[PDB]
Design an enzyme around this catalytic site. Structure first.
Site, PDB file in Angstrom:
ATOM      1  CB  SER A  68     -34.087 -10.034  41.578  1.00 44.11           C
ATOM      2  OG  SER A  68     -32.981 -10.194  42.445  1.00 44.11           O
ATOM      3  CG  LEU A  82     -33.162 -14.305  48.809  1.00 42.57           C
ATOM      4  CD1 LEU A  82     -32.473 -13.739  50.033  1.00 42.57           C
ATOM      5  CD2 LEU A  82     -34.626 -14.574  49.094  1.00 42.57           C
ATOM      6  CG  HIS A  93     -29.708 -12.305  39.655  1.00 48.49           C
ATOM      7  ND1 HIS A  93     -29.582 -13.068  40.796  1.00 48.49           N
ATOM      8  CD2 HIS A  93     -30.554 -11.295  39.982  1.00 48.49           C
ATOM      9  CE1 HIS A  93     -30.330 -12.511  41.754  1.00 48.49           C
ATOM     10  NE2 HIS A  93     -30.939 -11.433  41.306  1.00 48.49           N
ATOM     11  CG  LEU A  95     -24.438  -8.311  30.372  1.00 51.92           C
ATOM     12  CD1 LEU A  95     -25.543  -7.930  29.409  1.00 51.92           C
ATOM     13  CD2 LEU A  95     -23.648  -7.087  30.751  1.00 51.92           C
ATOM     14  CE1 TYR A 139     -21.192  -5.200  33.141  1.00 53.06           C
ATOM     15  CE2 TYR A 139     -19.303  -6.481  33.884  1.00 53.06           C
ATOM     16  CZ  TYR A 139     -20.535  -6.407  33.254  1.00 53.06           C
ATOM     17  OH  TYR A 139     -21.107  -7.535  32.718  1.00 53.06           O
TER      18      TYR A 139
HETATM   19  C1  LIG Z   1     -19.340  -9.540  28.143  1.00 47.31           C
HETATM   20  C2  LIG Z   1     -20.384  -9.425  27.035  1.00 47.31           C
HETATM   21  C3  LIG Z   1     -21.776  -9.323  27.648  1.00 47.31           C
HETATM   22  C4  LIG Z   1     -20.153  -8.144  26.232  1.00 47.31           C
HETATM   23  O1  LIG Z   1     -21.073  -8.100  25.146  1.00 47.31           O
HETATM   24  P1  LIG Z   1     -20.600  -7.567  23.715  1.00 47.31           P
HETATM   25  O2  LIG Z   1     -19.500  -8.408  23.192  1.00 47.31           O
HETATM   26  O3  LIG Z   1     -21.806  -7.366  22.875  1.00 47.31           O
HETATM   27  O4  LIG Z   1     -20.027  -6.136  24.109  1.00 47.31           O
HETATM   28  P2  LIG Z   1     -19.650  -4.800  23.339  1.00 47.31           P
HETATM   29  O5  LIG Z   1     -19.383  -5.133  21.916  1.00 47.31           O
HETATM   30  O6  LIG Z   1     -20.687  -3.787  23.647  1.00 47.31           O
HETATM   31  O7  LIG Z   1     -18.281  -4.432  24.039  1.00 47.31           O
HETATM   32  C5  LIG Z   1     -17.235  -5.409  24.089  1.00 47.31           C
HETATM   33  C6  LIG Z   1     -16.237  -4.982  25.128  1.00 47.31           C
HETATM   34  O8  LIG Z   1     -16.213  -5.939  26.211  1.00 47.31           O
HETATM   35  C7  LIG Z   1     -14.876  -6.480  26.301  1.00 47.31           C
HETATM   36  N1  LIG Z   1     -14.875  -7.915  26.657  1.00 47.31           N
HETATM   37  C8  LIG Z   1     -15.780  -8.870  26.241  1.00 47.31           C
HETATM   38  N2  LIG Z   1     -15.485 -10.058  26.735  1.00 47.31           N
HETATM   39  C9  LIG Z   1     -14.339  -9.866  27.487  1.00 47.31           C
HETATM   40  C10 LIG Z   1     -13.539 -10.723  28.263  1.00 47.31           C
HETATM   41  N3  LIG Z   1     -13.768 -12.032  28.386  1.00 47.31           N
HETATM   42  N4  LIG Z   1     -12.464 -10.191  28.900  1.00 47.31           N
HETATM   43  C11 LIG Z   1     -12.169  -8.878  28.803  1.00 47.31           C
HETATM   44  N5  LIG Z   1     -12.894  -7.997  28.084  1.00 47.31           N
HETATM   45  C12 LIG Z   1     -13.960  -8.544  27.463  1.00 47.31           C
HETATM   46  C13 LIG Z   1     -14.230  -6.254  24.952  1.00 47.31           C
HETATM   47  O9  LIG Z   1     -12.794  -6.210  24.976  1.00 47.31           O
HETATM   48  C14 LIG Z   1     -14.855  -4.939  24.526  1.00 47.31           C
HETATM   49  O10 LIG Z   1     -14.106  -3.834  25.030  1.00 47.31           O
HETATM   50  P3  LIG Z   1     -12.884  -3.241  24.200  1.00 47.31           P
HETATM   51  O11 LIG Z   1     -13.006  -3.801  22.824  1.00 47.31           O
HETATM   52  O12 LIG Z   1     -13.095  -1.768  24.265  1.00 47.31           O
HETATM   53  O13 LIG Z   1     -11.686  -3.719  24.950  1.00 47.31           O
HETATM   54  C15 LIG Z   1     -20.284 -10.647  26.072  1.00 47.31           C
HETATM   55  O14 LIG Z   1     -18.938 -10.798  25.609  1.00 47.31           O
HETATM   56  C16 LIG Z   1     -20.701 -11.958  26.738  1.00 47.31           C
HETATM   57  O15 LIG Z   1     -21.879 -12.277  26.810  1.00 47.31           O
HETATM   58  N6  LIG Z   1     -19.719 -12.720  27.208  1.00 47.31           N
HETATM   59  C17 LIG Z   1     -19.919 -14.010  27.866  1.00 47.31           C
HETATM   60  C18 LIG Z   1     -20.759 -13.907  29.137  1.00 47.31           C
HETATM   61  C19 LIG Z   1     -20.199 -12.898  30.130  1.00 47.31           C
HETATM   62  O16 LIG Z   1     -19.006 -12.921  30.447  1.00 47.31           O
HETATM   63  N7  LIG Z   1     -21.063 -12.013  30.621  1.00 47.31           N
HETATM   64  C20 LIG Z   1     -20.727 -10.973  31.590  1.00 47.31           C
HETATM   65  C21 LIG Z   1     -20.536 -11.520  32.989  1.00 47.31           C
HETATM   66  S1  LIG Z   1     -20.368 -10.194  34.216  1.00 47.31           S
HETATM   67  C22 LIG Z   1     -22.073 -10.022  34.796  1.00 47.31           C
HETATM   68  C23 LIG Z   1     -22.640 -11.369  35.185  1.00 47.31           C
HETATM   69  O17 LIG Z   1     -23.425 -11.964  34.426  1.00 47.31           O
HETATM   70  N8  LIG Z   1     -22.244 -11.865  36.363  1.00 47.31           N
HETATM   71  C24 LIG Z   1     -22.718 -13.169  36.845  1.00 47.31           C
HETATM   72  C25 LIG Z   1     -21.636 -13.807  37.741  1.00 47.31           C
HETATM   73  C26 LIG Z   1     -21.857 -15.303  37.877  1.00 47.31           C
HETATM   74  C27 LIG Z   1     -22.716 -15.935  38.733  1.00 47.31           C
HETATM   75  N9  LIG Z   1     -22.642 -17.304  38.557  1.00 47.31           N
HETATM   76  C28 LIG Z   1     -21.729 -17.581  37.574  1.00 47.31           C
HETATM   77  C29 LIG Z   1     -21.313 -18.810  37.045  1.00 47.31           C
HETATM   78  C30 LIG Z   1     -20.356 -18.781  36.046  1.00 47.31           C
HETATM   79  C31 LIG Z   1     -19.817 -17.563  35.573  1.00 47.31           C
HETATM   80  C32 LIG Z   1     -20.234 -16.333  36.103  1.00 47.31           C
HETATM   81  C33 LIG Z   1     -21.207 -16.335  37.123  1.00 47.31           C
END
Ligand SMILES: CC(C)(COP(=O)(O)OP(=O)(O)OC[C@H]1O[C@@H](n2cnc3c(N)ncnc32)[C@H](O)[C@@H]1OP(=O)(O)O)[C@@H](O)C(=O)NCCC(=O)NCCSCC(=O)NCCc1c[nH]c2ccccc12
Length: 166
Positions: A68, A82, A93, A95, A139
């Site tokens: 948003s 908001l 908000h 991902l 990021y």
């Molecule tokens: C992270 C994501 C989208 C990547 O997808 P993917 O797996 O397809 O990714 P790729 O394959 O394209 O790339 C993977 C890369 O991401 C890294 N990575 C993935 N998870 C990691 C972790 N836990 N720690 C460190 N590195 C990590 C990998 O290590 C890897 O890097 P390297 O291999 O090069 O090191 C996917 O894993 C996912 O959906 N995860 C769960 C939800 C989430 O956290 N969303 C992001 C919240 S950050 C944004 C957000 O939503 N904020 C809200 C904040 C919020 C508000 N209220 C809440 C209440 C509770 C919790 C949070 C909130």
């Protein structure tokens, strides 16, 4: 007649249920809370669906971004619920990628496509979001700069605010 192998499109309120299900496993199972509940997902998909993006594989949602507009430099507790129509910041908000589809570049592809999608909308000058410390490097690969501790608090979780100039 056909369910596309891969489809990228903005979401509508009809996708709310699918989005929330992903959040259950992606966020709730980990910390006990999530970015957007069903009503909040519906709110943003109604007010600003053009600020969302979803990846569908064989007719099923596997990744999404819900955003948003925000109109202040820093994110605040009130910004969570908001949409500032006059704002210039695309506030992401939430991902997330479905648990059976992670670690295969989907999050990165979706994020880059999102940045180009919203950046293309003349009104959006920047993108903002918050994440846990472990995702900061991730990021930074998309042009986001660490902007200090986010003021927003959720349970016992603390976040780093990230800003991306578009
Ligand atoms: C992270 C994501 C989208 C990547 O997808 P993917 O797996 O397809 O990714 P790729 O394959 O394209 O790339 C993977 C890369 O991401 C890294 N990575 C993935 N998870 C990691 C972790 N836990 N720690 C460190 N590195 C990590 C990998 O290590 C890897 O890097 P390297 O291999 O090069 O090191 C996917 O894993 C996912 O959906 N995860 C769960 C939800 C989430 O956290 N969303 C992001 C919240 S950050 C944004 C957000 O939503 N904020 C809200 C904040 C919020 C508000 N209220 C809440 C209440 C509770 C919790 C949070 C909130």
């Amino acid at each position: 007649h056909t369910l596309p192998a891969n489809e990228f499109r903005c979401l509508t309120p009809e996708d709310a249920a699918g989005v929330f299900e992903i959040e259950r496993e992606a966020f709730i199972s980990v910390s006990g809370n999530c970015p957007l509940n069903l009503d909040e997902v519906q709110h943003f998909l109604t007010l600003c669906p053009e600020l969302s993006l979803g990846w569908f594989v064989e007719g099923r949602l596997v990744a999404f971004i819900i955003g948003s507009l925000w109109d202040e430099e820093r994110l605040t507790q009130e910004s969570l619920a908001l949409h500032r129509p006059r704002g210039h910041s695309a506030h992401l908000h939430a991902l997330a990628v479905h648990r059976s589809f992670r670690q295969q570049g989907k999050g990165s592809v979706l994020l880059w496509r999102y940045l180009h999608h919203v950046g293309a909308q003349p009104a959006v000058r920047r993108a903002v979001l918050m994440c846990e410390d472990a995702l900061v490097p991730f990021y930074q690969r998309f042009g986001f700069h660490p902007a200090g501790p986010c003021a927003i608090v959720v349970g016992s979780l603390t976040f780093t605010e990230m800003h991306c100039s578009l």
